[PDB]
């Protein structure tokens with residue numbers, strides 16, 4: 635039974651991702667987030683090894699939710715007559731990276747490096763697990779402000795990872811690559827790398843570089859804040875117009891700008907506490 | 908200059 639197991643709290647937010655509430659699990663008072671998604675809005679369905687037919691989001695979360703990682707984990711889920719309910723982890727205290735950058739402005743490079751590194755590790759983990767998120771953006775990253783750990787959320791636009799072309803997309807357009815804009819075609823890793831370039835620019839400049847389709851396909855990166863030459867280089871590499879000119883995850887993590895990353899705990903002590 | 912969220916889903 636869903637309603638006797640969780641105590642429901644205030645609405646945290648709602649939108650394309652459903653309605654998400656704060657909650658506490660009654661059995662041990664563990665903090666949780668409770669996401670409701672209406673069946674009529676689930677366009678993408680999977681199946682569990684169960685054989686149970688579930689929203690794709692549940693399949694993806696289960697594939698990435700084993701062990702520890704930088705992904706907010708699915709603790710449980712339930713089906714209702716017109717909806718699915720997902721019980722997700724809830725770090726406390728938390729702020730999403732969109733609000734963090736709004737409030738703090740452009741991030742010092744040491745902070746952006748630590749954050750960006752953790753996002754890279756999380757995305758690697760998803761890919762190791764056969765999962766493509768397809769909506770990497772500041773809004774979909776939560777910062778645990780005490781542990782200095784970043785956590786990916788909202789896999790509702792994601793897919794199983796494959797090596798062949800994707801011709802569908804439900805993520806955020808201003809983080810989508812130019813081959814999607816021009817051709818409605820992209821490959822998973824290369825499109826992920828582009829969204830990571832958008833994210834890194836967002837971190838060191840205080841907002842994303844592009845709003846309009848013509849800017850996305852122009853691939854001219856104007857720097858609106860002082861950014862080091864090494865960081866500009868990495869961003870511009872991630873934002874290569876030709877997908878095959880973008881770095882691999884390995885190349886991003888071996889980039890000189892990425893060396894000497896702070897530990898999560900040092901990050902919290904220096905930058906968040 | 909205006910910073911805003913951008914919906915998906």
Ligand SMILES: O=C1N=C(Nc2ccccc2)N=C1Cc1ccc2c(c1)OCO2
Pocket residue numbers: 646647648651654667669706722723724725728776787788
């Ligand atoms: O898996 C999730 N998907 C979420 N989506 C979401 C929730 C509110 C606004 C925008 C998007 N939130 C979580 C988990 C979550 C975990 C800890 C939190 C939290 C939300 O809000 C504040 O603390």
